[PDB]
Amino acid sequence: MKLYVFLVNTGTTLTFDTELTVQTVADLKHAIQSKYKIAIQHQVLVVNGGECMAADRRVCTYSAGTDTNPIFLFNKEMILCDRPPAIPKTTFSTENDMEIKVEESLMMPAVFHTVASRTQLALEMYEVAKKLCSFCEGLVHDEHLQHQGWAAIMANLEDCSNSYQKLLFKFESIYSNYLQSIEDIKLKLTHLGTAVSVMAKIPLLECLTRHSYRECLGRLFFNVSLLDWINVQDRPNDVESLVRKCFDSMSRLDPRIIRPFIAECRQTIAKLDNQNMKAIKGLEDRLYALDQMIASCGRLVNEQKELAQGFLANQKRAENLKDASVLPDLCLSHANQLMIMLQNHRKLLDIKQKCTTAKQELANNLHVRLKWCCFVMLHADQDGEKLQALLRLVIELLERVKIVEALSTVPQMYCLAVVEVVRRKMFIKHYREWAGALVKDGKRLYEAEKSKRESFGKLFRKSFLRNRLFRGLDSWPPSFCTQKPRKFDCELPDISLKDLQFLQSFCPSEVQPFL
Amino acid sequence: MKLYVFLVNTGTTLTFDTELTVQTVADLKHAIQSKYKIAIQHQVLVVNGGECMAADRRVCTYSAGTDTNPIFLFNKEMILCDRPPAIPKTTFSTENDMEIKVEESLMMPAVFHTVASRTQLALEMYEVAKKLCSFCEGLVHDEHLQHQGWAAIMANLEDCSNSYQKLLFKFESIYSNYLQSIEDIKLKLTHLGTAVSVMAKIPLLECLFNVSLLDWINVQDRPNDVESLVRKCFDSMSRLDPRIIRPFIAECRQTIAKLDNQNMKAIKGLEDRLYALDQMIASCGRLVNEQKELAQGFLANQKRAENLKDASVLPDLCLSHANQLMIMLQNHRKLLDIKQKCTTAKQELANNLHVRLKWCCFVMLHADQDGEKLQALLRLVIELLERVKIVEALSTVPQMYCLAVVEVVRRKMFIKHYREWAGALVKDGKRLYEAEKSKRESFGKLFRKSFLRNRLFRGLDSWPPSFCTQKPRKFDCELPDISLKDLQFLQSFCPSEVQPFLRVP
Amino acid sequence: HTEILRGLRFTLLFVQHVLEIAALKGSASEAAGGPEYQLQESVVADQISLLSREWGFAEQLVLYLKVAELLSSGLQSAIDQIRAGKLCLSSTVKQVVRRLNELYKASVVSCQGLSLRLQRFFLDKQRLLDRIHSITAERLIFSHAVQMVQSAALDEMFQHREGCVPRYHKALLLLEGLQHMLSDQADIENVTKCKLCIERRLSAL
Amino acid sequence: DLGTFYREFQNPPQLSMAEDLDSLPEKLAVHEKNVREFDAFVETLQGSDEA
């Protein structure tokens, strides 16, 4: 067996050693350059099954390429060539000899010597008769491989089409979300702009020094506002930049521009789904007729080679006999038979020309169909690139929406946080006074009771009644509320009551920071 | 290595298989009785250093058994008998037959066969003298072993005497302490009588009905009640009064004084006995050396006689033989005198050790009975000095009863106050903590730990310690339910003597 | 045939000793004597006993109840063996059975009287009597025998070697009957150890 | 061996009252019955016999 590749558009099989299994797909195109020669850029290769051979894979992967299943190749440059590509015609020189010598032998009288010369002529011509439709069997391969490669590239195109359909479906789903999210983001962007306006006149307290703890003295006037901090965190983005980019993306994603593009995408889907070009009108019955004619090869051979062998044997015997009563009639009968077999041989020539003509017209229709296929491929590539870019933009919008939502509340959360932190700073004061008082009293109680109990036990330890008549005298108080509770809220910054004052009087957050 | 044991009383070597070594003292006694027919119960066994055999320790643990340091077996049978034992000898008629032949050989004329008889006689005589020397040395080394036996029993005696003297001194000191406390003990007993009279009246509360505290004290550790304790103390005081103990300790000190009789522990004439018997051993060795020399000279003279066939030589050579024979007879009688002196010295040492051991056994038995008596008296005194501690405890019982009642009622009152105090504290603590936690949880829900949780307003995730949120653990759970009513009842009924311990908050 | 008379006679002797123990437990607390007798004892110990006598009365009652049970069982055995012809009807059986009957009558009367004069004491102290685990006649008899032997040994050591023999004999005869009363094998082994030690001493004498 | 005799006797090892006293009256009734029966029998112990 051997590795094989087949060129479909020109209908040309390619023979390769099975040994080449050790080399990649790029190496296989370069092997087509090594034995044959066509520039790699022209080479488009697909397998029965439709997979477009990835350059890095080795042929061992793909389960085809044999004598009985080469891989399909296409010179898309030749396809893009305006011309209908011509036949890589083979030079069948033997036909010239056959015609010339056939006429030569026919001209001379059909005497037994001339009939023997015609017998030799038959030995040559009607034996190469087998070669003729052996070559036509090569073409028979060519034809059914053409159908198979046609189907393979159509599996490839259909795969591209389902990828296109899924991509557009996801696009229209995310845009169905955007259907309401566009007005929602308009509202939320009004909200963010409102928030930006709000951040003016709500100063970032001098408690910045404490919020950035490491700097307080560690870095060893301007009323810095919440602006120039919100955007300072996330330095490169101005937040105003966030609004600007949201508006820009909204404009590009507007249905005004988007819906016509999706209409073009739908038309691209329709063209990808063009069953008319995807099919060939009656190629199956065409190949069925070709099957009938290749069968006619064998049938007619069963006519000729029979007659030829019989004539050869009979002429040998009769000429060796030199019988004048048998040679004339038998030889002339064989001459008329040779005339009819010459008609049959020429019929071989017409069927050869007919099958080559079939090759040519299928190749021309296939040239047009590959032009359509390449146009669809290019349109699909463009549309896929654009769809991916716009999907990236849509997801950018659908993430910046959450970023805007987060950054919108920041004045509300600043107010809530400042009020809560002052509340805790005062509640800890109250709780500390409270715990101090309670612990003082509890320690007093505990020490007094412990002193009394020990001063008694010291007397009662040396007694006969201890633990025999009187029980439980060795117990102690539960030591409850005796020691100061551990710390809490020590990590809260030193925001003053005067800081809430610093805010509220001349920095309107709209009342909310009021306690 | 091989095991040997000794009967010091007579001085007979006892030899055993090594199988007894893996065995122990009791097995040693049984083996002694079985193989040598000495009763087990009569066996007193001692090692160098003065240790007496406990029946438990394996014999080798006591480092003895070799021929130079065996176990010493002292027989009670032989000390119960008044007379000293008899000692055997190595008996042979060969000595007397040899003497008779030497006397006869002196009167046998000068002929070759006579000289042959002479040389045979002398060759045998050398061996006889050698065997006499060996037997004598066996006896004398056996004596030198009887001496380590006596010294071992002396060591045991000294250890026993020191222990007995220490015990007597200890009892004398403890008895002096008791003697200076007889009046105090009697006063404490009178006080216990008073305290029992008091306890008879103090009601016993339901710490578990005309039950008094005395009845409760009585039902404890019966039938050893307080009356039994007092009478036992009085019995011991009766048994320990100095009119008995002082004479008894006088008799004891007399016992130690007789234990100090160095005239019996030390063998007088020991040094002389060694100085004489070892010198006699040296003399017998020299005598046997001369005997061997002259026997070989006899052989040489026989060699000369058999070859010098001249009739004038044999008579003179036989005169020389007669002079030599007289020399050999003198040497033989000297060796036999050495034998007699050694045997009589062994018998004399046996008798002297017999008398000294009779004295030692008597002294040791007297000291042991005195030790038993003193141990009993020490136990009496210590038990009495503990019973007086019990007596003092019982004397102070009635006061401690009232004080414990007062303490229990006060503790009930304090618990009543403490539960209220803790209830108020926990009420307030739970109120405040729940309010604060509700507010903080509300703020956490509003903040959603999302927006500025740590970026700007750092560390809002902190809570109060839940201090004073749960009530204190239980305490004073086992105290008897001594109501204030019970204390009032005791103040109503208890005698005046223990009222001051009740009339207080 | 007459060995059963040995059993009855031993029962008689043992109860005649337990009755002596009971009498000693009575009002007259057994005091010491001689010039060494501290005159303070007859004051202090006598006072305490006069204060706590009723517990001694209860001990006397349990001892009398135990001797009543012993005599009842012994006489029931004698009754059965006389009725069945297993025991000789006359001769020495007469005197032993009649003496057992006399002692039984005395014991029944004594325990009835002590119950009558302790009825009030029991009704008063019942609340305390629950906590105390009942003191049994076996404990009392064993303790009395042990203390008798200890006292006799002390007296013998301190030159009184003559009057000790009867005390040892009485202690031995008490323990001989005490073993038959105990059921726990540990207690029986203890009693046997003490009895065999007393036997060793008596043989030494 | 008086010494070891005492030494082991220095302290030989030792060997709800309401229940026994509650059972007491029945016990004494039983005892009275028993004494009556024993007296009634021993009154009849006048025979002659030997074994």
Author numbering:
A (entry chain B): 1 to 220, 303 to 597
B (entry chain A): 1 to 208, 304 to 600
C (entry chain C): 840 to 1044
D (entry chain D): 462 to 476, 487 to 522
What does the paper say about this structure?
The unc-51-like kinase protein kinase complex (ULK1C) and the class III phosphatidylinositol (PI) 3-kinase complex I (PI3KC3-C1) are the most upstream and central players in the initiation of macroautophagy. FIP200 is the central scaffolding subunit of the ULK1 complex (ULK1C), which also contains the ULK1 (or ULK2) kinase itself, ATG13, and ATG101. PI3KC3-C1 contains one copy each of the lipid kinase VPS34, the pseudokinase VPS15, and the regulatory subunits BECN1 and ATG14. The two complexes coassemble through extensive contacts between the FIP200 scaffold subunit of ULK1C and the VPS15 pseudokinase subunit of PI3KC3-C1.
The ordered core of ULK1C was purified in a form consisting of the FIP200 N-terminal domain (1-640) and the ULK1 C-terminal microtubule-interacting and transport (MIT) domain (836-1059) fused with the ATG13 residues (363-517) responsible for binding to FIP200 and ULK1 ([Fig fig1]). Image processing and 3D reconstruction resulted in a cryo-EM density map with a local resolution of 3.35 Å in the best regions, including the FIP200:ATG13:ULK1 interface ([Fig figs1]). The structure confirmed the previous observation of a 2:1:1 FIP200:ATG13:ULK1 complex, while defining in residue-level detail how ULK1^MIT^ and ATG13^MIM^ bind to FIP200. The ULK1C core has dimensions of 180 × 130 × 90 Å, contains two molecules of FIP200^NTD^ and one molecule each of ULK1 and ATG13 ([Fig fig1]). FIP200 ^NTD^ forms a C-shaped dimer as seen at low resolution, which can now be described in detail with sequence assigned. The two arms of FIP200 consist of 120 Å-long bundles formed by three twisted helixes (81-495). The two arms are connected by an 80 Å-long dimerization domain (496-599) bent at nearly 90° to the arms, resulting in the C-shape. Cryo-EM density of for one copy of a ULK1^MIT^:ATG13^MIM^ heterodimer was observed on one “shoulder” of the FIP200 dimer. ULK1 binds directly to FIP200 via two main interfaces. The ATG13^MIM^ collaboratively binds to both FIP200 and ULK1^MIT^ ([Fig fig1], [Fig figs2]), consistent with the role of ATG13 in recruiting ULK1 downstream of FIP200.
